[PDB]
């Protein structure tokens, strides 16, 4: 694989984000992954809509969390493979309140056919990733609360409790990394990432991959 | 039973604590119940330890969640029914980060000889705590991110995702209502508490109502 | 016991000191206390000899570390009780070198006539300080490296491996915590004091408090 | 025996590290040792985990010290032989705090069968260095505190409290020497090198030296 893959220097990821107070991070996750995945497949960059599935996936919980493959699913099962944009279907959950499902009045920014899930196996994971672009993952994030920089090397593995998306990884530098956007506004870590030491499982950052598949 | 109850009153309840960047809630809201219990088993009012729970109560997961009945389980079958004080086993998790649990150098300060788990029925929780003291209670807290004050009447009842402490109700009040200690501060709401309607499962605050024994 | 005493306040603690590149802590808290005992007893303050015990005190091992209690038995059996000044036998290891143990030239500061081991209880230890003075404790300070300020409430309790002096307590405080003096300049934490927690058995603060004597 | 063997040269050894503000070097010096070995039986040189025994070796004391001995005897009796990579249990200790143990998510760089105590003999020490490669030693390093070159003659030489690395002599020095690896980054004298005068037992360099085994 390549020694080092950065998807923001390509063009492939979208400004970073902000939840607000509420527990979407799967969804921003899925999403993420979905707007890279339709920039890959030759289309324009283009933000599209969590709050489609903090409305109307309700085989997730809103602002009470989720399962990235589960939206993937959604998504295909009950939405048809569609994806509406962000401007046409904004979101609206930043205070914790999600407002009703909506249908009519949106527009459809992508269309995926499935999902696949990765190997538990971090090398297997970034070898894709270098082909195949950026990858939903669930971390345990409960060790982030104060980041502020560098390449994080003790990160609390215990208990898989956020989704994010893996952007990168840098296999040269002194401490091997991944490259990570988190849905916490520009302000948190470096401008919205963190770097989180690769090959140890930090964060149990290789138990629960996935990419949506626009193929 | 009474017209209304509170137990902050009667000098049953410790003062409105903080979880910081935790998700500890579980830990706070059964370490407040075993306080008060403790304090209506005719013993002084005393702080006990979230995290003596948080640390060492391996069937729930730290900072990242967990469930009051867990918490009251492992006190019992784990640790010999004893709950050590908040002075021999102070909070240290409000960055998120829980040290590792130790066993040695505490303090018991009240010990549970099990719990009991309410009628998922309003009613009967109230005359409950009419008799027996404050209760824990799961919430869904999803809605409750811009509430400064007033008896909440629309809570966002979908997901427990939360565990407070009811404290007392009114039912003579023309809108009647729960009395709920969080556990994010005075800053928080009144002085740290919620009043949400009672008598229409608002937050489903009668689905998972428990309380230790002291008995 | 009182609700809170600072032997500080009281012009019982001479200057905060620089073990310097040497592992003479334990020297360090043995003089310290010495010093305050010696006030304690009626006379003016004076700082006393670290190197006086690194040179000469061989049941010890100079910059590679020693103990407290030996340090005091020495004191007795080996120098029939006389500390000398600081001033007339400077602290010369610094730079991690010990010159060899000279007795003529010195001046005796300070006479003790034994030590006493107090017990392993938090509560009794202040109680004693409290109407004694200051006390020599060995601490786990392994987690010490980027105290700053504030009570400490997670310190690593482990391996005892430092030597310092506990000149106070607050147990008013919201959080109760022990004043303690190191030996690692001024420029170290709140002046060359740390505040931890008082009643978790902090840095195992417990297990090897004690103190000379004067009487 | 060679006239002089410098291991370095050869390629038998990985860059110079820093234990940070923790006194782990017991740790490094076992771990230097196994990289050496294990490279000596064939196998490509590899950077392993001194965090594992840090975290993990609870017959030693993590940042409060250890023997290498101990940790060869760890790494056998409890770890199946294993040894990680430092790539997948990066060091996290230099701070003074190290995280708890994992047992998952690391991958094994090297495997060994058990270890070897040395004479307390320098010839014989050397002898056995240049046919089986860099050789653990405990140090008395109470008086490098000022080094930066040159060829150490008045070593302080009273207590063993430091664990470094052999990694060659040379005999045909006016002075013939030792050359040993230190943990404290290559800022510390010759690129993270010392050179201790060979023959006169310096720095009490012949009183522990061992070895793992990896045939
Ligand atoms: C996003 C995580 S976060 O809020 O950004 C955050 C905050 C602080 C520290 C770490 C992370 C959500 C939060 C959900 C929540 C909100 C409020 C109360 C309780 C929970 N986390 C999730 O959605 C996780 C993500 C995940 C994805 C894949 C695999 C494992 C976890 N999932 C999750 O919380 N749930 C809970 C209930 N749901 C039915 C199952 C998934
Ligand atoms: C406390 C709730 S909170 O953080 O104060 C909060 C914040 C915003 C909105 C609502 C509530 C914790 C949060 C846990 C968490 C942190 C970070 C990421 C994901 C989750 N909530 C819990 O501990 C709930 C409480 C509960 C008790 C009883 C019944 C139902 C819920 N439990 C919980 O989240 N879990 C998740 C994982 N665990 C293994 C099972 C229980
Ligand atoms: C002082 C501690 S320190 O150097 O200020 C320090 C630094 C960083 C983190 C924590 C503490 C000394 C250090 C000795 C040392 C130097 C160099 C290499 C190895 C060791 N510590 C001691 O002197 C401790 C104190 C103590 C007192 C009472 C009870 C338990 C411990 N004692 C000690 O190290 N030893 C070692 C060998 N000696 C014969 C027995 C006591
Ligand atoms: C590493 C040595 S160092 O920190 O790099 C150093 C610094 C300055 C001068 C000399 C050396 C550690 C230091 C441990 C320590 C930290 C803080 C306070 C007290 C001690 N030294 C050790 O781990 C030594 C190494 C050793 C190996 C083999 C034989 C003899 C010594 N071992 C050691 O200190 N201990 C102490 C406690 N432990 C239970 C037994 C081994």
């Not at 302000?187 to 990432?193: A, K, S, T």
Request: hydrophobic share 40%; proline share 4%; with cysteine.
């Amino acid at each position: 694989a390549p020694a080092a893959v950065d998807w923001r220097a390509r063009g492939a990821v979208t400004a970073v984000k902000d939840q607000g107070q509420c527990g979407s991070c799967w969804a921003f996750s899925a999403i993420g992954n979905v707007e890279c995945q339709w920039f890959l497949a030759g289309h324009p960059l283009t933000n599209l809509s969590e709050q489609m599935l903090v409305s109307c996936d309700k085989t997730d919980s809103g602002c009470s969390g989720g399962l990235m493959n589960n939206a993937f699913e959604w998504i295909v099962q009950e939405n048809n493979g569609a994806v509406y944009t962000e401007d046409s279907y904004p979101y609206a959950s930043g205070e914790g309140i999600s407002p009703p499902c909506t249908t009519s009045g949106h527009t459809v920014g992508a269309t995926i056919t499935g999902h696949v899930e990765l190997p538990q196996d971090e090398a297997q994971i970034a070898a894709w990733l270098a082909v195949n672009g950026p990858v939903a993952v669930a971390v345990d994030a409960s060790s982030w609360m104060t980041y502020t920089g560098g390449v994080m090397t003790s990160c609390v593995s215990e208990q898989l409790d956020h989704g994010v998306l893996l952007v990168g990884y840098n296999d040269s530098a002194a401490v091997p990394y991944w490259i990570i956007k988190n849905s916490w506004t520009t302000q948190w870590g470096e401008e919205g990432y963190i770097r989180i030491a690769k090959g140890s499982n930090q964060c149990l950052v290789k138990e629960e991959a996935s990419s949506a598949v626009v193929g």
